[PDB]
Amino acid sequence: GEILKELPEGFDKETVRKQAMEDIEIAQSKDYESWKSRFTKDLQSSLTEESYDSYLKILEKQGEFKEFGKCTYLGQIKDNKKYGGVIIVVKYEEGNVNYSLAYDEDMNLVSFTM
Amino acid sequence: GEILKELPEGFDKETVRKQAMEDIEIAQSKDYESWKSRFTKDLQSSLTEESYDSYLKILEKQGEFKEFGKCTYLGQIKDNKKYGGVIIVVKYEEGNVNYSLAYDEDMNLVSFTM
Amino acid sequence: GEILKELPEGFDKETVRKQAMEDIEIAQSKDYESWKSRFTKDLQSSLTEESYDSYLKILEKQGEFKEFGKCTYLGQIKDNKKYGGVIIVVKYEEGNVNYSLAYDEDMNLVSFTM
Amino acid sequence: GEILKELPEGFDKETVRKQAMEDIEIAQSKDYESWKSRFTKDLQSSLTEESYDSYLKILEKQGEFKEFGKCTYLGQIKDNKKYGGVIIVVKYEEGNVNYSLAYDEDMNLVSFTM
Ligand SMILES: [Cl-]
Ligand SMILES: [Cl-]
Ligand SMILES: [Cl-]
Ligand SMILES: [Cl-]
Ligand SMILES: [Cl-]
Ligand SMILES: [Cl-]
Ligand SMILES: [Cl-]
Ligand SMILES: [Cl-]
Ligand SMILES: [Cl-]
Ligand SMILES: [Cl-]
Ligand SMILES: [Cl-]
Ligand SMILES: [Cl-]
């Protein structure tokens, strides 16, 4: 495998930033089924509502969403497949939070971490 | 804050790689209290044995430890404090696993992810 | 000193990209004095018209400017001062050329390489 | 094409660091023909003794070689071929100098800059 300090081939910054902002808004909506639907078909059945509700508990403590900040792009080659990652700053009333999201080439989530 | 694509000042690759290999060996030992003791004093009380046992469940499915592989170094500046990170390949009988570890300047864990 | 795999603090990607494209256009204009004036005061005396004319000779062999491509951002800390760098793709009729430009915090050139 | 913030596949850090230090020592030896011979066959005809002697003039002003410092690894994909790069610190009596060297997969120089 490989860890990349930029996006892999086939990914582009603007598409990744735009999808990450939409996917964080879907996570903040508290709609578990819409958030689950943003993951690759093969990983959806690996997700739980309990784990999502634990994220919502921590999320509520941040206060109101204020703005999106800077993006840091990364990548990974795992089992000859490419994954594009982004560390995006989300500014809440109680402070800045760094989200880590990763996508497959079809732009569906493989990972989502607050 | 800042996301860095190398270690911050005050960290060095050899020290970080050596500590990451020791800390992954302590995690594989199944000794929860020794593993907990490797985290910064302020984060120890945030850890649970249940979360560590969930890691041990996933770890057991990998088979026997075979070797350490390549290291990828990263960093973060959060609330004017520096954190050194490493993505290290751990080769098990069932395949390669990428661990993500982060340290404070005193070389105690702030994050540990399989 | 430090070589960084991102811009240092005080530099912004969008500002760097705009200045790099402007500065490469000034270099392509064949106006030596305007190009020289884009460098920090301390480095102006170090530049020669002969060296700039050698660049123009190599530049003419590329054909017509077609487009700017992708940017790769880097940085450097040298004698406690911060320098923001960019590797920018310049697409000419005869092919792609990677320019390396570096700036001081006042957004004046410290380095320019075709 | 691609600019990478790590070595491409097929390159190893330790091999690159050893070759870069060897190649900088050959450059410092003032042996033009040995230095030229370290470049890929296609690029040898492009080198001049005059350009190498200009480097030797600047090199002599640095004083005695003291030590090699840190390495920063980069890469490039150009016309579907992979190139591994290193920015290596060379500490001279008069101060630190950052050399930029790039290699093809056969570990022959494609670029050498002081
Ligand atoms: Cl691409
Ligand atoms: Cl892009
Ligand atoms: Cl340091
Ligand atoms: Cl180091
Ligand atoms: Cl900044
Ligand atoms: Cl920026
Ligand atoms: Cl002149
Ligand atoms: Cl080039
Ligand atoms: Cl490899
Ligand atoms: Cl390596
Ligand atoms: Cl000659
Ligand atoms: Cl330098």
CB atoms within 10 A of CB C103: 27
Which residues pair with residue B84 across a beta bridge?
B75, B103
Cβ-based burial of B107 (10 A; exposed 0-12, middle 13-18, buried ≥19): middle
Report, in angstroms and rounded to the nearest whole number, the Rg of chain C calculated over CA atoms.
14
CA of C52 to the centre of ligand 7 (A): 9
Question: Which of the ligands is closest to the CA of residue A73?
Answer: 2
Q: Which chain C residue's Cα is nearest to A12?
A: C70
Amino acid symbol at D29: S
This structure's resolution (Å) is: 2.2
Q: Are B85 and B101 in contact (CB under 8 A)?
A: yes
CB-nearest to A5 from D2, D6, D9 is: D6
Query: Which residues does chain C have within 8 Å of residue A6's beta carbon, measured at their own beta carbons?
Result: 72
Could you give the CA distance from residue A11 to residue A106 in angstroms, rounded to a whole number?
Answer: 9
Q: How many C-beta atoms surround the C-beta of residue B1 within 10 A?
A: 15
Q: Report chain C residues whose CB lies below 8 A from the CB of B6.
A: 3-5
User: Which tokens in the block code for residue A6?
Assistant: 């930029």
Single-letter residue type at C13: K
Tokens found for residue D72: 């920063």
Nearest listed ligand to the Cα of residue B9:
3
- Set out the domains of chain D in order of their start, with CATH numbers: 1-113 (3.10.450.590)
Method underlying the structure: X-ray
- Rounded Cα distance, C64 and C94, in Å: 8
Q: What is the D42 CA–ligand 1 centroid distance (Å)?
A: 28
Cβ neighbours of residue C88 closer than 8 Å, sequence gap 6 or more: C17, C20, C21, C24, C68, C69, C70, C71, C72, C98, C99, C101
What chains are in contact with B, requiring at least 3 Cβ pairs below 8 Å?
A, C, D
Interface test with B, best of C2, C5, C13, C73 (most B CBs within 10 A): C5
Task: Give the SS3 label for residue A70.
Answer: strand
Closest CA to A79 of B97, D11, B61: B97
Which tokens is B8 given? 């911050």
Choose among A2, A6, A9: nearest Cβ to D5: A6
What is d(CA A37, CA A34) in angstroms, rounded to the nearest whole number? 5
Closest residue, chain C, to B5 (C-alpha): C5
The CA distance from D4 to C90, in Å, is 17
Q: How many whole angstroms separate alpha carbon A96 and alpha carbon A63?
A: 11
